[PDB]
Amino acid sequence: ASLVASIVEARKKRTAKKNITPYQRGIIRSLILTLDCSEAMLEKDLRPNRHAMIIQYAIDFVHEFFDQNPISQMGIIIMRNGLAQLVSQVSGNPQDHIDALKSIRKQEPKGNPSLQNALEMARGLLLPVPAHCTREVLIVFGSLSTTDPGDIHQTIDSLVSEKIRVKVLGLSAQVAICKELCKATNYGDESFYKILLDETHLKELFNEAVTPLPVNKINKGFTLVKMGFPTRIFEDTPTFCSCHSKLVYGGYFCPNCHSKVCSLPTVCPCCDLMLILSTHLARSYHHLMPLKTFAEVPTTEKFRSEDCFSCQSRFPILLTSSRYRCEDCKQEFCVDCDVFIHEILHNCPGCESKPV
Amino acid sequence: NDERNELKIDDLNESYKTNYAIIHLKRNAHEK
Amino acid sequence: MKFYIDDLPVLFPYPKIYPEQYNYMCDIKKTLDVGGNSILEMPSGTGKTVSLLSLTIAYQMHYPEHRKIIYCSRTMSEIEKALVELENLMDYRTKELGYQEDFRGLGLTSRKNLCLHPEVSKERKGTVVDEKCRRMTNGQAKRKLEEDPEANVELCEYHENLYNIEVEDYLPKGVFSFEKLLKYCEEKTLCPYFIVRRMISLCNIIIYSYHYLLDPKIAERVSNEVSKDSIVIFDEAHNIDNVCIESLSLDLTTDALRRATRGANALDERISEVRKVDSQKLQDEYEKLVQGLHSADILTDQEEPFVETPVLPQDLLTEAIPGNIRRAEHFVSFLKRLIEYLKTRMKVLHVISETPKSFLQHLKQLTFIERKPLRFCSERLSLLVRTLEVTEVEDFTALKDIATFATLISTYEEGFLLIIEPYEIENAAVPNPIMRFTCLDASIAIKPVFERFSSVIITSGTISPLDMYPRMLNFKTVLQKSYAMTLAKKSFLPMIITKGSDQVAISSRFEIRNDPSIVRNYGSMLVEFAKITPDGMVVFFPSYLYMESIVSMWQTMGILDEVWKHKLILVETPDAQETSLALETYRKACSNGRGAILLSVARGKVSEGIDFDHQYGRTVLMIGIPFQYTESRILKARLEFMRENYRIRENDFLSFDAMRHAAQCLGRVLRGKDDYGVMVLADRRFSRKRSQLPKWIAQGLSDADLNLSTDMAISNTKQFLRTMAQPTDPKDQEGVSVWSYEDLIKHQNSRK
Numbered sequence A: 001a002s003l004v005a006s007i008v009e010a011r012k013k014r015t016a017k018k019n020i021t022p023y024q025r026g027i028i029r030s031l032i033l034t035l036d037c038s039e040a041m042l043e044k045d046l047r048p049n050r051h052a053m054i055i056q057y058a059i060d061f062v063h064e065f066f067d068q069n070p071i072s073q074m075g076i077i078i079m080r081n082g083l084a085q086l087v088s089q090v091s092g093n094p095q096d097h098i099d100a101l102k103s104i105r106k107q108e109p110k111g112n113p114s115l116q117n118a119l120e121m122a123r124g125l126l127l128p129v130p131a132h133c134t135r136e137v138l139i140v141f142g143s144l145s146t147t148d149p150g151d152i153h154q155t156i157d158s159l160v161s162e163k164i165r166v167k168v169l170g171l172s173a174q175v176a177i178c179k180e181l182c183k184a185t186n187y188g189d190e191s192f193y194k195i196l197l198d199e200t201h202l203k204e205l206f207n208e209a210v211t212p213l214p215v216n217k218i219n220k221g222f223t224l225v226k227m228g229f230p231t232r233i234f235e236d237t238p239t240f241c242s243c244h245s246k247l248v249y250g251g252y253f254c255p256n257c258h259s260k261v262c263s264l265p266t267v268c269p270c271c272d273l274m275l276i277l278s279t280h281l282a283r284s285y286h287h288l289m290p291l292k293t294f295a296e297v298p299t300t301e302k303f304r305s306e307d308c309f310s311c312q313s314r315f316p317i318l319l320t321s322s323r324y325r326c327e328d329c330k331q332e333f334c335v336d337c338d339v340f341i342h343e344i345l346h347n348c349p350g351c352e353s354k355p356v
Numbered sequence B: 001n002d003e004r005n006e007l008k009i010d011d012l013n014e015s016y017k018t019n020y021a022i023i024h025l026k027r028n029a030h031e032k
Numbered sequence C: 001m002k003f004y005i006d007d008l009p010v011l012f013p014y015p016k017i018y019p020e021q022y023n024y025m026c027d028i029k030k031t032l033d034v035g036g037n038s039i040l041e042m043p044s045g046t047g048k049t050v051s052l053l054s055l056t057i058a059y060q061m062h063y064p065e066h067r068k069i070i071y072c073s074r075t076m077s078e079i080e081k082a083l084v085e086l087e088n089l090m091d092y093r094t095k096e097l098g099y100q101e102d103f104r105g106l107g108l109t110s111r112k113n114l115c116l117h118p119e120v121s122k123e124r125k126g127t128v129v130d131e132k133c134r135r136m137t138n139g140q141a142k143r144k145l146e147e148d149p150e151a152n153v154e155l156c157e158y159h160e161n162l163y164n165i166e167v168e169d170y171l172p173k174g175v176f177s178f179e180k181l182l183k184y185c186e187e188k189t190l191c192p193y194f195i196v197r198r199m200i201s202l203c204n205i206i207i208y209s210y211h212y213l214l215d216p217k218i219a220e221r222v223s224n225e226v227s228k229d230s231i232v233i234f235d236e237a238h239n240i241d242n243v244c245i246e247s248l249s250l251d252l253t254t255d256a257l258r259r260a261t262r263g264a265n266a267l268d269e270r271i272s273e274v275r276k277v278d279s280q281k282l283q284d285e286y287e288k289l290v291q292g293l294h295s296a297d298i299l300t301d302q303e304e305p306f307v308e309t310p311v312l313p314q315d316l317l318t319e320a321i322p323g324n325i326r327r328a329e330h331f332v333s334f335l336k337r338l339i340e341y342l343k344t345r346m347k348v349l350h351v352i353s354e355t356p357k358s359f360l361q362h363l364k365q366l367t368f369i370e371r372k373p374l375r376f377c378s379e380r381l382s383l384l385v386r387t388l389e390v391t392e393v394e395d396f397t398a399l400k401d402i403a404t405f406a407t408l409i410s411t412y413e414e415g416f417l418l419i420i421e422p423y424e425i426e427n428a429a430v431p432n433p434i435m436r437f438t439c440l441d442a443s444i445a446i447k448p449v450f451e452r453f454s455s456v457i458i459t460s461g462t463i464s465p466l467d468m469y470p471r472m473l474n475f476k477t478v479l480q481k482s483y484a485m486t487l488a489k490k491s492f493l494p495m496i497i498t499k500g501s502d503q504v505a506i507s508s509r510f511e512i513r514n515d516p517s518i519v520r521n522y523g524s525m526l527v528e529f530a531k532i533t534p535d536g537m538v539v540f541f542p543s544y545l546y547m548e549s550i551v552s553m554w555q556t557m558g559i560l561d562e563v564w565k566h567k568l569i570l571v572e573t574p575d576a577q578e579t580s581l582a583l584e585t586y587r588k589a590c591s592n593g594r595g596a597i598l599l600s601v602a603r604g605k606v607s608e609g610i611d612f613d614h615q616y617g618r619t620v621l622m623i624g625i626p627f628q629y630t631e632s633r634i635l636k637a638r639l640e641f642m643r644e645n646y647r648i649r650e651n652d653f654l655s656f657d658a659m660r661h662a663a664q665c666l667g668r669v670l671r672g673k674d675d676y677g678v679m680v681l682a683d684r685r686f687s688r689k690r691s692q693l694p695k696w697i698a699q700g701l702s703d704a705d706l707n708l709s710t711d712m713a714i715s716n717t718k719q720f721l722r723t724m725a726q727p728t729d730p731k732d733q734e735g736v737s738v739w740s741y742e743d744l745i746k747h748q749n750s751r752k
């Protein structure tokens, strides 16, 4: 019954996963991550303290974010002494943001938070962003009160007019203004305001924000963006880089001005042209053609083979059949592959193998 | 106008419905 | 939605409905069809007013009888909420039936709340507003203007403009709230107060406060126009007895009598002046008095009597004037010596309580005033003043109080008591004698209402126990039941705290209000909760004096400085306008995330109609049981009357009275089922009152929460708030707490 208890719970966990449709998502993102560093974040509800754990998870989030969003940009803001302090400008270099976050980890948080100051700073940082990018703001709020110099409601109206999207992660309880901010700014959706219940749930919440947010039907900004694919060149002698002005062995050559760049993806320092490899675009295709989920086969019918199609793991005979089939190709898979096929891979081997 | 919205019971109104757009991607291209 | 009852189709203004609302509607329909009175206790977290309007409006529009609806609330603010809900419901009906049906609905209030005159609406007292309006609307100015246009007397364009149009065309068909009514009348220069009062006989549903139904002074004029078979609803009637008692109560001070002699002397001087120049008016009035006419036959419908009838219409004598006070001079002398007897009775040195009969006998002894002439004091005065051309009545205002006392003491003899105290304030350098006329029986004022109207519905959010109200008020109910909300997940956490973090017992007994340990223990509770409460916090104190003393102690200790760091502090004040601004600031602070804490009085103005749904209220801190001041002569006499007559124990009533107020405040936090909040009762004496709380609140109070400490309370509150912040599972409430149209049909099938 204990194993069956997992299965019935698994079926309930699979109930939400059943409804999957290819919703349009904005791959080009421009995220502004806001952190709360106030007196309320000195509590011990999160070990060792909220400030330490949040910073530690922020480092992990940065790594994951740039891993699945190679052509996006991020900016870091913190709240301190009732003011918003900029610590990282919008940039495509994951190392610069990580270094900035590490430095912040030392100073002790103090003072009160100010949403209006943080929102206003985020509003200005996203002003010089193309219209094809999705402007998003992620806030890690821990305080139950906000001290602002002006009217927060006016800022909320401005954010909606600027088509910015706000996600807020709370620590203790729901704040009415935060709920309004996450609702009025998301076309009335109320699922963008999440309050954690433990340390483990926080990791999932951070991981969820990595994926691009679906776009609204009435919000259309379709356009073509000019991109370039530079060719890597190997040089015998070091040469000055056009981005940092330092001697480096080799760098990718822009096909529009031949200027060299240390690393990709980055905006060309000469023609202001985005340099991206073909692999970077390939990293986001799984969000446009997501692999359809697998449905377990009832034990009443007869199974095809005793071994897994993909990993050759012998199916445990033992009640409920531990087999999941693909509707497109109708090939049974073990429980292990389905997790690996939907988290690591994004293509069904059975469908590819079938000839047409 | 503003007072009317406050006095109404939101919980009894129709649940918010998502209005996200769907995309179907056709796949075809010329050979190298 | 639009579902069906046994034979009555009802249109709900929402696509969804709670199980309680449908059960509430079914019981109401049964009572209306069967006849009689009933007492229904519906939870505050479920739509009550909307359910009442939906069913009752459909009932009047479907059955051939087309019985009218009378809605009685406790405060003017509640009338606005009811009208707004009515407008929303009627809009839904107009959109589903395809046309605007013949329907009229208006709210009622005093001139102060509906006066548009640029010079008369700027007054801080309602009595002055009434006097000015009567001067411009009595008709003396109009009659004087007709005779001689040169007269400087002015008119009211709003009142004058109404004569052009007929009564049926004052307002277009539909429902007009106060906010909408003023805007429509301002654009046409009309008086909303006169428009409403002249259309009561034409309104399908009429909404007014309890004072307009139970107080004989103002109820008689309004009651004379309403129908006899109309539906009567008593919403939030858990404190109706206080209104009933205050209607037939009066207080006389030394200053009131001192101001009465000056008015009486002025009245005599005015009579002498009129006697010299214009004596025909007195003779004309005297001739009618000899005939046997009264104020009703003499005064026109346009004008109002100077002294409002202080007794019920059924207790007024229909015989002619006795003859002693038939003449102006004789009546003035009668009035003058009556004042002296009151003055000489204010020199007592110890509290004396006597029945009206004993007072009358002593009055008949020292002087020679009989009972019958005393009963006509108010009626006679209104006639004399009206005929005296008293355009300015500032001097005679005090005489109204004496006339009211004379007509009250000489009319009722059972259930009334007369209290004379040598110390109005026990802590006073100089004694301040006071004469109080108190009404002990609470059913005297409401007896005519329960007899004139066949069907009456009494509903409130915290009316419990239901058995006592029929005992206190002499009436019988066909059914009396209370509903329990079927909430899928716990939405409110009621807790009782008996001791502080140091395990020291905490109580709000007045004798120990100045205790460093209790004051600190309560202060620690306030600070600790304010740290976890997200946006709003309402704090209710047993009495305003208790709040003043304890708040001042906190200021000296330094508790407030710590509270200021987290939330803004707003405090209720005796001034009504200042308190209203505080609520506006408190609501603004909670909406913008600044966070605010409101300190109020459980028996104050806030608790009698102000709501804190969602953000404006997330935690209720009841600082002590709101016990009444036991060492009160008025209260002690009231308790004795109930014990001897209704066999109600003194302790039981006192506990019931205190709990009915504590529960009242608790129900002002939940709107719908998506609303949540933590209710903490901070007193060691709440531990044994669980059985006395409302059923829907008691069911939510666990056995482990009956006696908690401050530290344990915070831990539970933090856990509860965290739990309520998660996305609710829709399947957990698809058909167990909220019903769609399909689910409602299923319930009607299984039940049948």
Ligand code: SF4
Pocket: C111, C114, C115, C116, C117, C120, C132, C133, C134, C136, C137, C156, C158, C159, C191, C192, C193, C194
């Ligand atoms: S008639 Fe109406 S507007 Fe004119 S003074 Fe009286 S209440 Fe005010």
Ligand SMILES: [Zn+2]
Pocket: A241, A242, A243, A244, A245, A246, A248, A261, A262
């Ligand atoms: Zn470089």
Ligand SMILES: [Zn+2]
Pocket: A254, A255, A256, A257, A258, A259, A268, A269, A270, A271, A272, A273
């Ligand atoms: Zn270039």
Ligand SMILES: [Zn+2]
Pocket: A308, A309, A310, A311, A312, A313, A333, A334, A335, A336, A337
């Ligand atoms: Zn496998």
Ligand SMILES: [Zn+2]
Pocket: A326, A327, A328, A329, A330, A331, A348, A349, A350, A351
């Ligand atoms: Zn497949």
